Design a protein around this ligand. Structure first.
Ligand SMILES: [Mg+2]
Ligand SMILES: [Zn+2]
Ligand SMILES: [Zn+2]
Ligand SMILES: [Zn+2]
Lengths: 107, 237, 124, 87, 48, 286, 597
């Protein structure tokens, strides 16, 4: 009996974001090439949809502007890294800063 | 009835750069744009109170749109209708609607329908105002609709209960503030914890009914305009 | 030799482009190409090729029961057939082949419910 | 990596469908993608199996895109930075 | 080519062709059909 | 194709997590990716000088005698200890293998000898005048760098806070520590000044950081691809081979976890006891 | 309202009961007629409420124009119940376990408390269990046998007397099962055997059966359902009239062949095998904006460059979103249209949310900020370059586009040394190439999938690229000590000409008079000075097999490079060859990065 829904606790309990203190993070302080590439791609798409920038040197493509923002440490994004899914509905992340963190080769 | 309620929802942000400049104001504006005047999760959400919890503005992972979502957990004041509640005014729209229904101009947008099986039915006309009592079949708070849907008919632990008795005390002040000759005329026309709760609910229903009856009929000429209902109830003594 | 633009005949069933140059649309990124792109950790070229340049669609899952929902923002319909009143429709990016697959399985009376990632709120 | 995958359960598990059942029993979608989707689908239905979405095949068969590579780490917007600088 | 009424067919290929054929043959079902032949002038291109 | 697809679906779920462990969903497959946490594209083969040297040869070459401080006795004892550990581990590895011989060439992220050579070539000064203070300072900073080497696997913050390092992280950087000790020995950095030595150390740290595996890298597919191709050439070599190892039969036995009965080319290699009685062929034959 | 973004975290497979269908289906199928006129019949199996297979009409249910509508399930209430075709074995295993007269289990359940849930029911069913007696109603247990002519028929024999187990009887028996028996037998609540019998099957959404083949079986099923009387109350031993027996058997076989025929192609036949739904539509896909052609060599292309024929560069397009910074650069693209190169044929105006062809925009002349323009692929753009089968990690890489504006060239041109990435040759091989048009994919392609990343093999940690064939032997001839005519020297003009096609910054020959004989190794050292390395190995030229014969020049049998100055020896496969670990290109990669390599 029952249509697989009435007893179905399908709605997962909402999670609370716990941010690990800045002195407790144990992940690399250097952007992995995946993370740097994702940051550049997100920033460049957002410049395509919006167009605003903090650069002084004006470029003719959002890719170049986002790449320089990552290189010149003005990209307005925060890489958050998540390490847990606790049964207590408590997602454990540590929010890193791409401006403070090192930058891989990418070239 | 009105009561604040917490709602959890996920927004979508088509320009996260502009969104985060004034994050809280943008969240309030978007929640007002999306959630006011519409039913949600067995509620109506009359007004948006400030948010309680909100998420960081993530970026949509699964699509290359570059947008973000952000989860929002906010409180909002809603309007709910219980069983056999008393709303004092309905306004009919169409005469080719022989099933007899109408629209409500009160601060609880509800499409009200009245069955055509009772004696006091099929006699009304378009543009007249008639009090209607909700039936026992509850209220359909379907979502995405600018007004709720309902059915109705023409009317014929100690400190926990302190909050309930607190509401009725302020409602009495609402009755005294407004003009009392209309209230007197209308009252002449209509003349442990669980039982306390239901008794208090009935008291609330009747007192809110008389107050809304006083409010609904701003000027006295409509009373003669809608005089065909006075006899309709008076014959039912 | 063959070269195709972003438009062409699409499969009636899956919504994917047709097969080869003869059907005026197609060319395939099979299993191996997806393995290679994942090994490179592409996941933005995989998104683009597999969704934007293929059978891309936006599913809706009620999030209150996990069953697919009925949503349309132009003609307003925010409803579910399992909890109607308590619907919490969520926009889920997906592919039309995946939805067709889920419908094939559901038609075999094995019900599919998607849990959906729970909402995360930073502390007050 | 090959050896650590097979020996991760304390027993030598093969790369065949039996080994995939032994290592990832709850990943119904992955085993469906590997071989014999109807049989493993029947088994998942009768077992009421819940398949958490991870890896490559499980989100691919669901139409999503796997959380590996470029999209392993989530990206959020720095409200403080935009507020202080962009306007 | 062979406009038929709309159920006409197009060319389709990206290489232009010169037409030398117009016939209306009587098929097995005695009905008339199109059967137009196109000619392509092929030099030894790079990649042949 | 058959073998590769089976292997791919076996391994595809193995993804490097934020700890550089290889994990399925959340269950571990590996404590560290290659047990060193290094990308396969960032490896260079360099010889370890001290491995084959006799004890007196080691003392002749690597023992520093220009200063009577016991710090250099400690440094040379550390070199000898590292050489002995390498010999022991790889002699054991040779022991439980058929014909895997010990070699002193190993793949490491940073070629310390090349970096030392480059800095020495670019050095303005030639033979540096003797200076005990600078030599002791250089030794101290090399030792501190080697002590802080496992912190390339965590970050600079836990390096500043000097928080404890997990044991496996210390073990992962043991080979790089050994190479750095061998190549930055005081007998080899006499002409390298303190500024040039600090430059060498930061360059080594940077190249180590750039050699680590990425978070989220789909390493399982990498392993499946890397092992699938050699099978193609392996069976194409069956027509040189005859103990039925022809075809994918042996790879089938390995990958399908076939039991002992299912084996067709089973072998044992048993060592004769009493290592002074196994040098003769007659006793071995009997 | 607004549907906020969400991601799927888990999938739960459950058996769908009759309530599942009844509450999930959008309507009920009552009439067997497919089409009235040229439109679907309301209440028919093609009813538009279940989806749309035509651009003419919308879904009614969701009001979407086909591509935006995923289909919605339909419900057909069977006049007589049917067994679930997928779970016939599960029904059989449940029947033999449980008593058919009271709903209580007759197998000793306490003996299975120590077993995992998946194993309990199958182990209990594996027992003998025949001829047993119930402990609460004393009814003896008939033995269950499967018919040898069909899969869904159960014969219950009580010591010899044979009676067919009908779906109604089976449904009642399962409705007699208590939840405690299901739980104690290693089955979840949602796997109650009551769900294994269907009174209302689900008519699948027409979106998965488009085009008017498996709809034939659906229509046949509805027609044969209409033939059954609406109140076929079959008790055990009823002995219903034989016509009803064949009609019910036909309905059951029709449903079974609708689900698992040959497992017409049924639903389940669509899934397995390579051409199935999974291995073809899910694990792979067909894509747009992709081109395929025959590869060919081009010695004048950089290793990270591909020769894209111009005819293709106008077919494939790159989406450039107009903003304030790129207005002036994008204007020449817009003006050219399809008439010139570089041009563009598309415009996506956001305010109108519409796409316009460039030959219909003679009066627009204006691109707003936020407009999307689809311009042609110009030289310098990144493009993915793939040869199938994609065995290696380097089988897909990104090359900078070099557009060959010769209209007579249609082959993909690559440097010969770039073949080691794809294991390709030019004997007729074809490689797919697609240009990323989105900003995200372009960024990723240039930063992550560029072929400079795959210069060092992931498989073997050595370099994949190098000199092959004519470059290896050419390097040997260039660096060998003695030509047959004498010493290997060249005048100033020819040493100058060696550097013509390198495309780097040419060295300085002002120190050399026109009559100065530049050595063979001096010119190599001139190039290697830009990336000085140290290398010392025996060349492949010096082999001990050849050594007893031939005179080996002493200056050729030891290649030795000191700080990028080639001192002695020759360059051959060991030094410059492809795949050579420790070669000069490997060292250049190690010290200066793979791009300089
Ligand atoms: Mg070939
Ligand atoms: Zn729902
Ligand atoms: Zn629809
Ligand atoms: Zn019984």
């Amino acid at each position: 009996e029952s249509p697989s829904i009435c007893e179905g606790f399908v709605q997962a309990s909402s999670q609370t974001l716990v941010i690990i203190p800045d002195n407790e993070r144990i992940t690399s302080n250097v952007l992995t090439t995946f993370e740097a590439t994702r940051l550049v791609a997100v920033r460049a798409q957002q410049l395509a949809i919006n167009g605003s920038t903090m650069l002084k040197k004006k470029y003719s493509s959002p890719i170049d502007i986002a790449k320089q923002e990552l290189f010149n440490r003005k990209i307005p994004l925060l890489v958050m890294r998540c390490i847990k899914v606790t049964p207590e509905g408590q997602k454990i992340v540590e929010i890193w800063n791409p401006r403070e963190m090192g930058i891989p080769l990418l070239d | 009835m009105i009561d604040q309620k917490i709602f959890e929802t996920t927004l979508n942000i088509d320009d996260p750069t502009n969104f985060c400049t004034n994050v809280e104001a943008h969240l309030l504006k978007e929640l007002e744009n999306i959630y006011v005047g519409k039913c949600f999760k067995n509620s109506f959400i009359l007004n948006i109170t400030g948010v309680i919890q909100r998420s960081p503005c993530f970026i949509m992972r699964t699509n290359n749109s570059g947008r973000g979502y952000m989860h929002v957990r906010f409180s909002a004041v809603v309007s709910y209708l219980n069983a056999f509640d008393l709303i004092a005014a309905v306004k009919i729209i169409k005469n080719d609607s022989n099933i007899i229904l109408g629209e409500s101009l009160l601060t609880e947008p509800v499409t009200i329908v009245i069955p055509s099986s009772e004696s006091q039915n099929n006699v009304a006309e378009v543009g007249q105002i008639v009090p209607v009592q909700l039936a026992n079949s509850s209220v359909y708070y379907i979502p995405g609709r600018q007004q709720a849907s309902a059915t109705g008919s023409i009317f014929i632990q100690a400190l926990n209960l302190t909050k309930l008795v607190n509401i009725i005390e302020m409602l009495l002040e609402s009755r005294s503030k407004k003009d009392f000759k209309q209230i007197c005329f209308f009252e002449k026309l209509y003349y442990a914890e669980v039982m306390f709760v239901t008794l208090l609910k009935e008291i609330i229903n009747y007192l809110q009914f008389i107050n809304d009856l006083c409010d609904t009929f701003n000027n006295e000429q409509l009373i003669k305009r809608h005089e065909n209902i006075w006899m309709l109830i008076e014959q039912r003594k | 030799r063959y070269a195709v633009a972003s438009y062409g005949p699409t499969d009636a069933l899956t919504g994917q482009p047709l097969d080869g140059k003869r059907s005026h649309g197609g060319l395939r990124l099979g299993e191996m190409e997806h393995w290679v792109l994942t090994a490179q950790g592409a996941m933005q070229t995989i998104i683009e090729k597999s969704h934007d340049d293929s059978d891309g669609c936006i599913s809706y899952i009620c999030r209150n029961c996990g069953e697919p929902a009925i949503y349309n923002a132009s003609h307003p319909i925010y409803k579910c057939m399992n909890c109607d009143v308590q619907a919490d429709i969520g926009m889920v990016d997906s592919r039309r082949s995946s939805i067709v697959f889920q419908h094939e399985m559901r038609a075999a009376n094995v019900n599919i419910t998607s849990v959906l990632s729970p909402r995360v709120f930073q502390p007050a | 990596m090959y050896a650590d995958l097979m020996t991760r359960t304390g027993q030598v598990t093969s790369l065949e469908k039996a080994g995939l059942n032994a290592r990832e029993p709850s990943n119904v979608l992955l085993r469906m993608a590997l071989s014999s989707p109807v049989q493993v689908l029947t088994d998942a239905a009768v077992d009421s199996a819940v398949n958490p979405i991870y890896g490559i095949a499980a989100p691919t068969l669901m139409g999503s895109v796997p959380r590996i590579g470029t999209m392993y780490s989530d990206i959020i917007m720095d409200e403080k930075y935009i507020t202080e600088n962009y306007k | 080519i062979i406009g038929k009424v709309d159920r006409s067919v197009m060319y389709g290929f990206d290489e232009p062709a010169v037409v030398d054929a117009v016939m209306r043959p009587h098929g097995p079902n005695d009905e008339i059909f199109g059967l137009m032949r196109l000619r392509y002038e092929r030099n030894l291109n790079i990649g042949d | 194709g058959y073998a590769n697809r089976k292997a791919i679906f076996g391994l595809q779920s193995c993804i490097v997590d934020y700890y550089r462990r290889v994990s399925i969903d959340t269950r571990l497959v590996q404590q560290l990716y290659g047990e060193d946490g290094l990308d396969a594209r960032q490896l260079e083969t360099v010889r370890f000088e001290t491995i084959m040297l006799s004890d007196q040869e080691l003392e002749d070459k690597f023992k520093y005698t220009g200063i009577q401080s016991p710090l250099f006795e400690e440094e040379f004892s550390r070199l000898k200890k590292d050489r002995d550990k390498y010999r022991q581990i790889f002699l054991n590895v040779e022991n439980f293998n058929f014909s895997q011989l010990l070699t002193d060439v190993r793949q490491v992220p940073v070629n310390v000898a090349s970096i030392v050579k480059n800095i020495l070539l670019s050095s303005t000064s030639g033979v540096l005048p003797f200076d005990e203070k600078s030599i002791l300072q250089k030794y101290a900073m090399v030792k501190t760098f080697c002590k802080n080497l496992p912190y390339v696997f965590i970050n600079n913050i836990q390096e500043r806070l000097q928080t404890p390092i997990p044991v496996y992280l210390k073990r992962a950087a043991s080979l790089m520590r050994m190479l750095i000790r061998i190549e930055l020995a005081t007998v080899k950095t006499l002409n390298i000044t303190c500024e040039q030595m600090s430059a060498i150390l930061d360059l080594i740290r940077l190249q180590y950081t750039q050699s680590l595996i990425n978070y989220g890298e789909a390493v399982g597919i990498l392993a499946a691809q890397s092992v699938s191709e050699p099978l193609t050439q392996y069976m194409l070599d069956s027509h040189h081979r005859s103990t039925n190892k022809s075809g994918i039969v042996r790879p089938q036995e390995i990958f399908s976890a076939k039991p002992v009965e299912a084996e067709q080319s089973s072998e044992m290699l048993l060592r004769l006891k009493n290592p002074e009685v196994e040098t003769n062929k007659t006793y071995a034959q009997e | 309202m607004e549907a906020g973004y969400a991601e799927i975290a888990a999938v739960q497979f459950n058996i769908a009961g009759d309530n599942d269908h009844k509450r999930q289906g959008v309507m009920e199928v009552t009439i067997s007629n497919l089409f009235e006129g040229t439109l679907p019949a309301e209440g028919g199996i093609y009813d538009a409420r279940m989806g749309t297979t035509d651009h003419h009409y919308k879904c009614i249910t969701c009001s979407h124009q086909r591509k935006q509508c995923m289909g919605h399930p339909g419900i057909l209430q069977m006049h007589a119940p049917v067994l679930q075709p997928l779970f016939i074995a599960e029904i059989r295993r449940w029947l033999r376990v449980i008593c058919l007269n009271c709903g209580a289990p007759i197998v000793d359940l306490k003996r299975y408390e120590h077993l995992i849930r998946p194993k309990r029911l199958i182990e209990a069913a594996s027992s003998q269990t025949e001829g047993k007696q119930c402990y609460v109603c004393k009814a003896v247990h008939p033995k269950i046998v499967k018919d040898s002519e069909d899969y869904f028929t159960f014969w219950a024999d009580q010591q010899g007397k044979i009676d067919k187990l009908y779906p109604q009887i089976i449904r009642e028996i399962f409705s007699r099962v208590t939840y405690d028996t299901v739980v104690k037998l290693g089955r979840s609540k949602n796997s109650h055997p009551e769900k294994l019998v269907l009174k209302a099957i689900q008519i699948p959404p027409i979106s998965i059966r488009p085009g008017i083949d498996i709809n034939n079986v659906i229509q046949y099923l509805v027609r044969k359902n209409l033939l059954i009387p609406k109140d076929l109350q079959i008790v055990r031993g009823q002995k219903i009239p034989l016509n009803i027996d064949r009609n019910l058997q036909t309905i059951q076989q029709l449903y079974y062949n609708f689900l698992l025929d040959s497992v017409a192609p049924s639903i389940m036949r669509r899934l397995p095998r390579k051409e199935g739904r999974i291995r073809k539509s899910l694990l792979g896909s067909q894509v747009w904006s992709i081109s395929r052609s025959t590869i060919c060599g081009n010695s004048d292309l950089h290793l990270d460059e591909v020769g894209y024929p111009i005819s293709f560069a106008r077919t494939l397009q790159v989406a450039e979103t107009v903003q304030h910074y790129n207005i002036n650069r994008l204007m020449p693209y817009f003006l050219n249209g399809k008439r010139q190169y570089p041009g563009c044929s598309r415009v996506y105006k956001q305010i109108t949310q519409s796409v316009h062809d460039i030959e219909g925009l003679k009066q627009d002349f204006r691109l707003e900020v936020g407009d999307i323009l689809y311009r042609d692929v110009v030289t310098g753009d990144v493009a993915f370059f793939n040869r199938q089968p994609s065995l290696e990690r380097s089988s897909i890489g990104v090359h900078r586009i070099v557009v060959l504006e010769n209209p007579k060239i249609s082959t993909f041109q690559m440097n010969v040394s770039a073949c080691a990435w794809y294991n390709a040759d030019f004997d007729g091989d074809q490689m797919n190439l697609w240009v990323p048009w989105s900003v995200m994919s372009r960024v990723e392609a240039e930063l992550l999938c560029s072929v400079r990343n795959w210069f060092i093999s992931t498989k073997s940690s050595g370099p994949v690229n190098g000199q092959v064939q004519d470059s290896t032997v050419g390097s040997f001839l260039l660096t060998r000590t003695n030509t047959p005519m004498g010493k290997n020297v060249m005048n100033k003009l020819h040493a100058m000409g060696l550097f013509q096609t390198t495309q780097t910054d040419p060295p300085c020959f002002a120190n050399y008079s026109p009559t100065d004989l530049l050595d063979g190794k001096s010119v190599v050292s001139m190039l290697l000075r830009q990336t000085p390395i140290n290398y010392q190995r025996a060349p492949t030229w010096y082999s001990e097999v050849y050594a007893p014969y031939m005179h080996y020049n002493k200056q050729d049998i030891s290649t030795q490079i000191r700080n990028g100055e080639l001192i002695e020896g020759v360059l051959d496969k060991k030094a410059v060859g492809a795949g050579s670990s420790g070669g000069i290109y490997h060292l250049i990669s190690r010290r200066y990065g793979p791009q300089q390599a």
